[PDB]
Write an enzyme that holds these catalytic residues in place. Sequence first.
Site, mmCIF file in Angstrom:
data_model
loop_
_atom_site.group_PDB
_atom_site.id
_atom_site.type_symbol
_atom_site.label_atom_id
_atom_site.label_comp_id
_atom_site.label_asym_id
_atom_site.label_seq_id
_atom_site.Cartn_x
_atom_site.Cartn_y
_atom_site.Cartn_z
ATOM 1 N N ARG A 54 95.016 -30.226 56.122
ATOM 2 C CA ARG A 54 94.558 -30.913 54.913
ATOM 3 C C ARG A 54 93.961 -29.892 53.955
ATOM 4 N NH1 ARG A 54 90.233 -34.644 52.916
ATOM 5 N NH2 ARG A 54 91.329 -36.353 51.828
ATOM 6 N N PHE A 59 88.594 -27.933 46.317
ATOM 7 C CA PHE A 59 87.690 -28.659 47.202
ATOM 8 C C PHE A 59 87.530 -27.918 48.530
ATOM 9 C CE2 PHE A 59 87.055 -32.917 49.625
ATOM 10 C CZ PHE A 59 85.734 -32.601 49.829
ATOM 11 N N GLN A 62 90.953 -27.709 55.432
ATOM 12 C CA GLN A 62 90.492 -28.227 56.722
ATOM 13 C C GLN A 62 91.494 -27.935 57.827
ATOM 14 O OE1 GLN A 62 88.659 -32.105 56.807
ATOM 15 N NE2 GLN A 62 89.189 -32.492 58.957
ATOM 16 N N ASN A 100 83.630 -34.080 60.636
ATOM 17 C CA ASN A 100 83.190 -35.023 61.662
ATOM 18 C C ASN A 100 83.590 -36.446 61.288
ATOM 19 O OD1 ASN A 100 80.814 -36.435 60.261
ATOM 20 N ND2 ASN A 100 80.106 -34.307 60.171
ATOM 21 N N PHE A 111 86.007 -27.100 58.070
ATOM 22 C CA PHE A 111 86.614 -26.849 56.774
ATOM 23 C C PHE A 111 85.978 -25.640 56.111
ATOM 24 C CE2 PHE A 111 83.203 -28.856 54.230
ATOM 25 C CZ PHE A 111 82.641 -29.714 55.156
ATOM 26 N N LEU A 120 77.974 -33.013 50.507
ATOM 27 C CA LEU A 120 78.151 -32.954 51.946
ATOM 28 C C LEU A 120 76.879 -32.539 52.672
ATOM 29 C CD1 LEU A 120 81.728 -31.401 52.056
ATOM 30 C CD2 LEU A 120 81.013 -33.760 51.939
ATOM 31 N N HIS A 124 77.440 -32.821 57.126
ATOM 32 C CA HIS A 124 78.236 -31.848 57.851
ATOM 33 C C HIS A 124 77.387 -30.618 58.098
ATOM 34 C CE1 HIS A 124 82.038 -34.040 57.120
ATOM 35 N NE2 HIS A 124 81.423 -34.402 56.006
#
Length: 163
Positions: A54, A59, A62, A100, A111, A120, A124
Amino acid sequence: VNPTVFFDIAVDGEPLGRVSFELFADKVPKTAENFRALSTGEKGFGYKGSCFHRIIPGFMCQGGDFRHNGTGGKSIYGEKFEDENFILKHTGPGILSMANAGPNTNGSQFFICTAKTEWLDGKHVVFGKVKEGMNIVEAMERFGSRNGKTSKKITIADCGQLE
């Protein structure tokens, strides 16, 4: 004394380059040790040969699902483990953080931020940062897409511990 790990990245099987990370074991030892061991393969399983499934430009990238699509992965601890702390924040490109499925569900997916992602913080666990090869992460990012599907297969061709 913080460990350094490397990924050798390939794109449709062709070498792209090496990304290295500092792992903040002084801060988050349990989370750093999980990623370190998965990168060496010393438990019999880990990141070698897995893909970045991903990638969203601007951004993050991942990976770490060594089911290959975001539904799998496992820690070195025999089950998913707790959020160790949230001392470290998502402050810009290169931050390495755990993916997660809600509180206290860390496995092996992680990521690499390619921007500041402060929304985030507290969700995370940040546990490392890119040390060399951010330009390779930037090259990978260009094979992502708005919905995260990659246009070429992005793989960790080799990985391990440096120094």
